[PDB]
Amino acid sequence: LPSYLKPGSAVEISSDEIGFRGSWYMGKVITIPSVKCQVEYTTLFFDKEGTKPLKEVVDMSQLRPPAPPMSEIEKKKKIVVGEEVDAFYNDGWWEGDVTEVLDDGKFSVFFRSSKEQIRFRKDELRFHREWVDGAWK
Amino acid sequence: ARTKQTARKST
């Protein structure tokens, strides 16, 4: 079993339910056994009242480790038109292109799955990484 | 307060 799937460990969570395309939501593994585990989302809940954190059985292929801590130079390089990024939106990371860089530290970001175009502050974005074959790209 | 319902983008 992969190191990062140990119960208790932080993860990010993909989905192929339509309307979660391009998202990675943060959570934790609850139960390892089939090719499937159960997680607990850190920011979603079963209920508006938010008393019961959401829990769900997924495939292990919908899971990936937390994104790597950006180095200090990486953590402060410039963001440019066309960079792929993840914006923090509906309490989740969503992937989009940067289409405009604005004079006040702000960016405008195009989402292809949802035809959406939304402004964000720099501290609401992260650099989009992919997690293939065990390594961060 | 955020649920799958108030987070999804479609259907």
UniProtKB/Swiss-Prot annotation, chain A:
It comes from the Eukaryota. Expressed ubiquitously during vegetative stage, in meristems (e.g. root tips and shoot apical meristem), and in ovules and young seeds during reproductive stage. Changing W94A: Impaired H3K9me2 binding. Disrupted H3K9me2 binding. Residues 3-71, 77-133 are annotated as: Plant Agenet, chromatin-binding. Disruption phenotype: Abnormal transcription up-regulation of some transposable elements (TEs) and of hypermethylated loci (including MU1, GP1, SN1 and ERT7). Hypomethylated DNA CHG and CHH regions. Reduced H3K9me2 levels. Increased ratio of decondensed nuclei. It is found in: Nucleus. The tandem Agenet domains (AGDs) mediate the specific recognition of the histone 3 lysine 9 dimethylation (H3K9me2) mark. This is Protein AGENET DOMAIN (AGD)-CONTAINING P1. It comes from Arabidopsis thaliana. The lineage of its organism: Eukaryota, Viridiplantae, Streptophyta, Embryophyta, Tracheophyta. The chain holds residues 35 to 177 of 517 of the full protein.
